[PDB]
Amino acid sequence: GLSDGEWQQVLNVWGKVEADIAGHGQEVLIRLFTGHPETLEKFKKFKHLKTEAEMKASEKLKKHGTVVLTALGGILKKKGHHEAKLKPLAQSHATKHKIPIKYLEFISDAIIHVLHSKHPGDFGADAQGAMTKALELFRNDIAAKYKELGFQG
Numbered sequence: 001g002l003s004d005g006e007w008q009q010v011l012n013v014w015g016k017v018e019a020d021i022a023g024h025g026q027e028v029l030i031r032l033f034t035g036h037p038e039t040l041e042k043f044k045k046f047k048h049l050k051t052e053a054e055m056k057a058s059e060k061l062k063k064h065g066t067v068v069l070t071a072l073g074g075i076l077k078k079k080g081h082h083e084a085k086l087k088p089l090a091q092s093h094a095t096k097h098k099i100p101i102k103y104l105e106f107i108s109d110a111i112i113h114v115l116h117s118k119h120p121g122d123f124g125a126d127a128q129g130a131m132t133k134a135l136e137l138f139r140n141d142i143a144a145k146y147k148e149l150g151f152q153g
């Protein structure tokens with residue numbers, strides 16, 4: 001779905017993430033939860049966090065941020081051949097935690113927002129378009145697996 005140049009733009013900005021993956025992950029989750037509070041309800045560990053300030057002080061939230069962006073990074077680095085890396089993630093988010101595709105769109109938006117905020121010089125208009133396409137491919141392929149797994153997403 002993406003050109004070689006588009007994947008380069010994706011992996012270029014992703015390199016910036018790997019220098020502070022916990023900080024990025026924290027900011028992504030806080031953007032998600034504050035922008036779409038219904039998503040917070042999915043997390044038994046975190047839904048007690050009422051405010052952005054409480055979220056920022058949570059070590060466990062930050063650690064989960066690391067887990068999320070580590071998994072996403074592994075998937076992005078597989079470019080268009082990401083099915084093997086994506087498979088276990090689709091499975092867990094269709095069974096252990098049922099996460100609607102809409103919420104994956106919300107976190108996609110959050111990722112794009114955080115990347116634009118922290119690395120604008122590596123995330124101009126075209127790079128943002130490339131990442132948008134990469135995260136769309138991600139959601140589309142998860143959705144396809146969801147259905148096989150019997151989850152309407």
Ligand code: HEM
Nearest residue numbers: 039042043045067068069071072089092097099103104107
């Ligand atoms: C870029 C998208 C996402 C990625 C890469 C991702 C990745 C992960 C990973 C690696 C785990 C731990 C292992 C696993 O269960 O698979 C996890 C757990 C979890 N995810 Fe996601 N996730 C994403 C989006 C979401 C969204 C949008 C929600 C809810 C709105 C969500 C809800 C959860 C919950 C509730 C857990 C368990 C947390 C815990 O153990 O306390 N995920 N996720």
